[PDB]
RNA sequence: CACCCGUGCAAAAAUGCAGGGGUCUAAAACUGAGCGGAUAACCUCUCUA
RNA sequence: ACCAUAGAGAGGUUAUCCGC
């Protein structure tokens, strides 16, 4: 709907006093198309020009298109982004005012252009998405314990030192080793057989402990490095993976090279350690997450290369600082990322562990008590993909009690189209769509056992149908609650990143570990005193805000009045509930008594509000949170004031704060009404 | 259908029209969920040889 | 109720194709 791109203007740039425009090409590559110098302009791309300027007014430039359909559109002047009807021309800056800092962090100097900032914001987007999938991976492993062992690993302690921790007397180190022995002893490692097992008739057997430790250490260090800022040389780790110890290099090699040798594509010898670590990360994820992850990298890195290449035509300085020189190979790392995407496939189960998953399969359905029928249930449950997802990211017995929430299943049955629910109902009881949904919800909640002249194949078809229904309903519900949680994981990742970036700028944000709201308070220029906010709203403060966000009476006021209600302990427990996914681990309890479900936002926040109410039952809470919890226990549905309260640490980025605090803006796929 | 920005026009302080945004948000383009057969190909399950 | 041999069926990967 943006006519500009159709007309062919790809990315408008400011470079000193001049402006450049680019056109799409053979891929996400770019060609520099037009130079503008105040009112003068001249073409650089002489042969096969893509588009031509109609007018060259300093305010805006209208351009017609000779490539493609002859759309004509107007493009705003980058040098006039923040100058107008308020220094008549200046290079624009990001909404966070972080540009001078990010540019001096990644490159050795400021440039007086706005090419470099777009590249850096793509590197920030690379880090943003790994924060989600690294925590989901750690969640998938931690769910098998159904003790912070996973939250703690570092790559400095090779296994030869972790072996020594076997013989320590300190209760911390005995707990650290005992958690490893308990992890190894868990049969649920068969869920990740492509990672934890090796093939050697042939047979697949559990990998040597040194390797399994090197896998846990790698995924844990990646998770820690994504979600937290790392001071010192620990920051460059993902960009200095060449400095990994040989055990981790060899685990990455032998985990990656196996399907490569099956196909022979780049063997583990020449492929980048970054690509190999991304392959390792993908093993813990669902195939949809794998596609989402790996394509996002291909994009980000292709954008990065396109800027690196067009910068050379201008003669701008391309060279990164010595530590970030990782990105100077982004052509190669793009080649390896597409080679990865050529063959990356979801992790298979251990072919022989079917007898182990059997009890999970019957537990998901609540079957306890011929056993031929019981095997017919198990085989088809376990081979499904829904069972893969539910058993990795949920607990079998916990899923069964979740299906008993009538409003939750009656809700998710609304997402299935009417005709498809008729296609599902026809298989179950051989007439309005909502009466189907109601009776089918009862037949999901109160499922007991199969069977609780008709042909044998017909009864087999009925059973297989009701199985695949139940698995699909729970798959959808769990997947959507996970992908909701991922947004707050990105949010707190960005809160932690931007704290460190503001510190380099010079804002006295202080230690954000003690209280997550401190970044918002610092950016608003308010100090809490006697433990509470004291400065009532004054217009004077809004003009002093650091970021371009806020700086308005309405939002500075709504942020301040929500922050006054934002109890620090509640915010920290919300943060931990997000980052560990404890809200959905305890799904059985957090979902009780829910009176209605309006959407996945109202369900996820009901879960969180219930968790926050279950805890803090003894630990005292101040009057406004006591009133929120009373409203929660009165209306049996999520209190909309409470979410806008404990989301206040994100307020320093208003767009995020707003998108997350109210349902109508949360999901781009389900737009809804905004609240004034 | 949210945030920000540039023009035009109300105006008496803020609307409205029409646009832009890799430098806003999971968010610049390149569209998704839906499922019927087909062998090519191998497993797995009950059911009786 | 055991063992591999051997019809039907019912699944999941796998390359080809048709519509909300
Ligand atoms: Mg540290
Ligand atoms: Mg972006």
């Amino acid at each position: 709907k943006s006519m500009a791109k159709a007309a062919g203007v790809k990315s408008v740039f400011a470079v000193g006093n001049t402006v450049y425009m680019t056109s799409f090409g053979r891929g996400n590559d770019a060609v520099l198309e037009q130079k503008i110098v105040d009112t003068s302009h001249e073409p650089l791309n002489i042969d096969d020009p893509a588009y031509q300027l109609n007018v060259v007014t300093m305010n805006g430039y209208s351009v017609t298109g000779h490539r493609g359909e002859t759309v004509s559109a107007v493009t705003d002047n980058p040098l006039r982004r923040f100058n107008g009807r308020k220094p008549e021309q200046s290079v624009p800056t990001d909404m966070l005012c972080l540009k001078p800092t990010l540019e001096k962090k990644f490159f050795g100097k400021e440039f007086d252009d706005n090419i470099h900032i777009q590249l850096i914001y793509n590197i920030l987007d690379i880090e943003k998405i790994l924060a989600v999938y690294s925590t989901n991976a750690i969640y998938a492993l931690n769910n098998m314990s159904a003790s912070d062992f996973f939250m703690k690993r570092t790559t400095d302690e090779t296994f030869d030192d972790f072996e020594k921790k076997k013989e320590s007397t300190n209760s911390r180190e005995k707990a650290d080793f005992d958690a490893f022995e308990k992890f190894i002893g868990n049969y649920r490692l068969a869920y990740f057989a492509d990672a934890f097992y090796v093939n050697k008739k042939a047979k697949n057997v559990l990998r040597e402990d040194k390797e399994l430790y090197s896998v846990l250490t790698l995924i844990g260090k990646l998770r820690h490095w994504c979600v937290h800022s790392e001071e010192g040389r620990a920051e460059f780790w993902l960009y200095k993976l060449d400095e990994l110890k040989d055990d981790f290099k060899n685990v990455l090699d032998v985990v990656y090279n196996r399907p490569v040798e099956e196909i022979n594509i780049s063997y583990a010898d020449s492929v980048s350690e970054f690509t190999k670590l991304i392959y390792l990360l993908t093993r813990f994820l669902s195939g949809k997450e794998i596609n989402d992850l790996v394509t996002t990298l291909i994009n980000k890195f292709d954008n990065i290369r396109s800027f690196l290449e067009i910068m050379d035509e201008l003669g701008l300085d391309r060279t990164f600082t010595a530590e970030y020189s990782f990105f100077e190979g982004s052509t190669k790392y793009l080649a390896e990322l597409v080679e990865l995407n050529s063959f990356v496939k979801s992790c298979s189960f251990d072919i022989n562990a079917k007898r182990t998953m059997y009890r999970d399969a019957l537990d998901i359905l609540g079957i306890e008590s011929n056993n031929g029928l019981r095997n017919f249930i198990a085989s088809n449950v376990i081979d499904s993909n829904r069972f893969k997802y539910l058993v990795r990211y949920g607990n079998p017995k916990k899923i069964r009690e979740t299906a008993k929430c009538k409003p939750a299943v009656r809700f998710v049955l609304n997402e299935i189209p009417d005709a498809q629910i008729e296609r599902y109902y026809e298989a179950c009881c051989p007439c309005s769509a909502n009466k189907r949904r109601e009776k089918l919800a009862d037949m999901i909640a109160e499922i007991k056992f199969e069977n609780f002249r008709t042909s044998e194949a017909e009864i087999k078809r009925k059973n297989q149908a009701i199985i695949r229904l139940y698995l699909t309903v729970m798959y959808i519900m769990l997947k959507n609650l996970v992908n909701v949680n991922a947004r707050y994981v990105i949010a707190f990742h960005c809160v932690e990143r931007d704290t460190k970036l503001y510190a380099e700028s010079g804002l006295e944000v202080g230690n954000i570990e003690k209280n997550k709201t401190n970044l918002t308070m610092a950016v608003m220029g308010v100090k809490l005193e006697n433990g509470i906010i004291k400065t009532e709203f004054d217009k004077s403060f809004a003009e002093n805000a650091a970021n371009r966000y806020l700086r308005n009476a309405r939002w500075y006021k709504l942020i301040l009045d929500n922050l006054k209600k934002s109890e620090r302990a509640v915010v920290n427990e919300f943060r931990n509930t997000v980052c560990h996914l404890n809200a959905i681990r305890n799904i059985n309890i957090n979902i009780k008594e829910i009176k209605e479900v309006e959407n996945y936002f109202a369900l996820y926040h009901y879960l969180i509000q219930k968790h926050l109410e279950n805890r803090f039952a003894d630990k005292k809470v101040e009057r406004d949170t006591g009133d929120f919890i009373s409203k929660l226990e009165e209306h049996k549905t999520y209190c909309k004031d409470f979410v806008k309260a404990y989301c206040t640490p994100f307020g320093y980025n208003l767009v995020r704060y707003k998108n997350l605090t109210i349902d109508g803006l949360f999901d781009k796929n389900y737009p809804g009404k905004d609240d004034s």
Side-chain angles (χ1 to χ4, degrees):
Chain A
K1 274 312 302 172
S2 57
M3 299 179 177
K5 303 298 196 311
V9 276
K10 184 174 174 56
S11 50
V12 303
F13 302 148
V15 156
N17 197 32
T18 74
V19 167
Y20 286 85
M21 272 176 317
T22 57
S23 57
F24 309 86
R26 276 163 319 181
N28 204 105
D29 168 329
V31 179
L32 67 180
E33 200 41 16
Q34 303 288 350
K35 188 196 297 171
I36 303 175
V37 184
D38 310 278
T39 62
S40 184
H41 73 113
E42 61 185 4
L44 316 89
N45 184 12
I46 296 168
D47 293 338
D48 195 16
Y51 58 70
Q52 187 177 4
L53 311 81
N54 284 357
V55 298
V56 274
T57 87
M58 296 173 62
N59 199 294
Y61 312 96
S62 299
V63 39
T64 184
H66 290 343
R67 181 178 176 277
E69 300 65 351
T70 65
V71 179
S72 317
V74 44
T75 65
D76 291 301
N77 189 4
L79 290 180
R80 207 185 183 66
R81 193 169 307 239
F82 300 98
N83 309 357
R85 174 61 290 161
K86 46 185 168 57
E88 260 62 54
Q89 290 165 253
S90 63
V91 187
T93 195
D94 64 338
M95 301 273 307
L96 292 174
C97 303
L98 259 48
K99 175 183 191 303
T101 295
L102 280 168
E103 190 170 32
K104 191 180 35 178
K105 183 178 179 181
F106 285 89
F107 313 94
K109 61 183 265 300
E110 299 173 44
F111 280 88
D112 192 12
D113 73 62
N114 78 330
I115 313 184
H116 294 87
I117 190 60
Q118 296 185 65
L119 160 58
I120 300 173
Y121 260 79
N122 281 323
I123 297 172
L124 269 57
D125 292 341
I126 292 168
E127 288 171 60
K128 277 172 46 170
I129 200 151
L130 292 177
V132 173
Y133 296 128
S134 64
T135 183
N136 282 9
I138 287 295
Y139 172 48
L141 300 182
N142 177 340
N143 191 210
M144 295 166 2
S145 99
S147 308
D148 68 65
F149 165 77
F150 304 110
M151 310 292 176
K152 189 184 148 27
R153 299 267 75 63
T154 72
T155 201
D156 300 343
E157 46 169 20
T158 56
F159 188 75
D160 290 11
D161 278 308
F162 191 82
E163 173 177 302
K164 290 308 313 293
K165 298 182 179 184
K166 187 180 174 70
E167 302 185 324
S168 179
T169 196
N170 188 318
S171 302
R172 292 183 69 85
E173 284 143 11
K174 281 295 193 181
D176 204 24
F177 201 75
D178 175 318
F180 185 60
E181 294 279 43
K182 283 281 294 298
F183 168 91
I184 294 295
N186 204 315
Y187 71 88
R188 298 180 224 275
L189 264 80
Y191 303 161
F192 307 101
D194 195 351
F196 301 139
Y197 292 71
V198 53
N199 72 296
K200 188 179 177 69
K201 64 172 330 291
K203 195 54 54 181
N204 65 316
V205 62
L206 190 72
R207 292 186 84 92
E208 187 158 51
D209 308 57
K210 182 179 297 183
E211 316 294 29
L212 299 175
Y213 177 77
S214 303
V215 171
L216 283 297
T217 43
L218 286 170
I219 280 298
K221 181 56 176 178
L222 177 63
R223 206 295 302 270
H224 192 273
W225 180 94
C226 292
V227 176
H228 301 160
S229 185
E230 299 293 70
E231 276 107 319
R233 184 153 289 287
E235 85 166 0
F236 307 109
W237 178 68
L238 189 59
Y239 311 126
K240 287 295 183 79
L241 300 156
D242 181 36
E243 302 293 29
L244 284 174
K245 302 285 183 177
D246 302 4
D247 301 340
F248 312 115
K249 281 184 171 183
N250 294 349
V251 85
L252 284 175
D253 177 333
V254 187
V255 172
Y256 171 87
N257 208 59
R258 175 164 45 65
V260 175
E261 162 67 35
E262 178 179 305
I263 289 165
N264 278 276
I265 58 159
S266 54
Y267 291 113
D269 185 35
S270 185
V271 63
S272 180
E273 278 60 45
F274 178 75
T275 312
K276 290 183 286 193
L277 179 61
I278 298 298
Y279 182 115
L280 183 67
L281 173 56
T282 63
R283 305 291 110 184
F284 305 99
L285 307 179
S286 183
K288 291 191 183 227
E289 297 190 319
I290 303 199
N291 204 34
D292 194 307
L293 192 172
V294 180
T295 61
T296 300
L297 298 185
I298 326 169
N299 300 358
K300 265 48 195 179
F301 277 82
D302 204 358
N303 298 343
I304 288 163
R305 197 200 75 269
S306 74
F307 298 125
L308 262 52
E309 190 67 6
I310 86 161
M311 282 167 135
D312 195 67
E313 292 258 9
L314 300 183
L316 296 178
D317 250 336
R318 180 177 62 261
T319 57
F320 289 86
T321 53
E323 304 297 350
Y324 283 101
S325 62
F326 172 85
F327 294 106
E328 273 191 355
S330 185
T331 300
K332 185 175 68 172
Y333 305 154
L334 183 64
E336 298 327 85
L337 260 287
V338 302
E339 195 47 304
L340 166 67
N341 194 42
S342 190
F343 74 84
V344 73
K345 301 222 173 264
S346 183
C347 156
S348 55
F349 278 0
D350 172 0
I351 298 170
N352 304 2
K354 299 332 204 300
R355 266 290 303 190
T356 74
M357 285 80 81
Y358 164 100
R359 181 51 61 184
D360 304 342
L362 284 315
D363 193 26
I364 281 195
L365 293 146
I367 311 312
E368 61 293 60
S369 187
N370 287 92
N371 77 334
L373 178 148
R374 202 165 290 321
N375 278 272
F376 173 82
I377 297 293
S379 44
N380 55 57
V381 166
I382 311 169
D383 67 22
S384 75
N385 296 27
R386 283 81 156 97
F387 182 80
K388 313 297 192 285
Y389 192 91
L390 288 168
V391 89
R392 284 170 182 203
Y393 291 113
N395 166 353
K397 187 167 290 183
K398 297 192 183 298
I399 293 299
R400 180 57 188 99
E401 297 302 328
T402 320
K404 205 172 287 165
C405 177
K406 280 187 172 79
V409 301
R410 176 59 189 85
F411 168 70
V412 54
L413 291 174
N414 294 8
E415 189 164 32
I416 311 300
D418 298 352
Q420 181 157 10
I421 273 168
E422 213 78 1
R423 175 184 296 121
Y424 268 143
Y425 187 93
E426 173 65 7
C428 295
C429 301
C431 295
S432 64
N434 295 336
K435 188 56 53 69
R436 306 310 201 195
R437 287 177 176 109
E438 185 175 66
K439 178 59 182 182
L440 195 63
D442 288 353
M443 211 180 308
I444 286 287
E446 184 189 313
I447 187 172
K448 294 190 321 323
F449 190 30
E450 307 314 311
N451 200 44
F452 294 70
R453 183 264 182 158
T454 55
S455 188
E456 190 68 21
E458 189 64 88
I459 174 70
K460 261 48 207 191
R461 200 72 68 93
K462 163 175 163 65
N463 289 357
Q464 168 52 215
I466 185 165
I467 294 287
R468 159 164 67 265
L469 170 65
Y470 176 108
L471 287 171
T472 300
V473 157
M474 301 314 258
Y475 165 84
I476 296 179
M477 160 147 34
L478 182 69
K479 182 180 63 65
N480 284 16
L481 295 177
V482 174
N483 280 28
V484 168
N485 196 95
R487 296 285 292 289
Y488 296 103
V489 175
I490 294 177
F492 283 115
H493 160 74
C494 292
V495 156
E496 162 72 337
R497 185 194 66 221
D498 299 342
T499 294
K500 183 57 180 172
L501 290 168
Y502 278 129
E504 184 56 74
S505 183
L507 189 45
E508 218 144 338
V509 58
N511 190 347
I512 181 144
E513 182 184 1
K514 300 197 304 178
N515 182 347
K516 316 312 300 178
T517 61
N518 276 38
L519 183 33
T520 295
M521 298 202 285
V523 166
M524 298 213 307
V526 301
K527 282 180 77 67
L528 63 175
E529 67 89 2
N530 203 344
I532 68 170
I533 292 293
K534 184 34 57 174
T535 54
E536 304 166 34
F537 174 33
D538 183 338
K539 176 181 62 181
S540 210
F541 301 121
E543 297 184 6
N544 302 340
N547 54 355
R548 304 203 62 67
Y549 298 94
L550 303 173
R551 286 186 185 178
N552 73 71
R554 176 174 182 238
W555 290 110
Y556 192 90
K557 176 60 147 68
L558 261 59
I559 292 291
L560 187 68
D561 229 342
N562 291 346
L563 192 64
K564 280 179 175 180
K565 281 178 210 191
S566 187
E567 180 152 35
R568 175 181 159 264
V570 178
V571 180
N572 285 2
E573 174 72 351
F574 164 62
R575 182 271 175 184
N576 290 342
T577 299
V578 160
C579 214
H580 302 166
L581 293 100
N582 287 319
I584 67 165
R585 290 175 75 280
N586 290 21
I587 186 161
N588 331 297
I589 307 173
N590 299 359
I591 207 168
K592 287 277 286 293
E593 306 200 339
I594 189 165
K595 186 242 184 71
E596 294 297 354
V597 175
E598 297 184 12
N599 40 315
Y600 295 106
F601 177 89
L603 179 62
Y604 179 81
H605 284 287
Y606 183 80
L607 263 51
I608 286 185
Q609 291 185 3
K610 190 57 58 183
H611 168 92
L612 299 176
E613 186 272 3
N614 242 354
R615 196 177 309 240
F616 300 93
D618 36 45
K619 294 175 172 68
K620 198 64 55 177
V621 311
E622 32 187 19
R623 179 60 32 61
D624 300 295
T625 290
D627 218 348
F628 293 180
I629 281 170
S630 184
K631 272 187 289 196
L632 180 71
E633 291 303 336
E634 181 56 29
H635 298 294
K636 300 295 184 177
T637 49
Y638 91 115
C639 193
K640 287 175 290 288
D641 303 327
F642 191 16
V643 57
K644 59 187 65 174
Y646 60 76
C647 294
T648 44
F650 315 117
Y652 83 99
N653 182 307
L654 189 87
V655 168
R656 198 174 300 122
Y657 174 85
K658 201 158 169 51
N659 281 1
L660 298 176
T661 167
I662 36 169
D663 43 34
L665 303 79
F666 185 176
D667 176 33
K668 74 178 182 178
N669 304 282
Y670 302 170
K673 178 177 305 177
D674 184 22
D675 296 345
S676 58

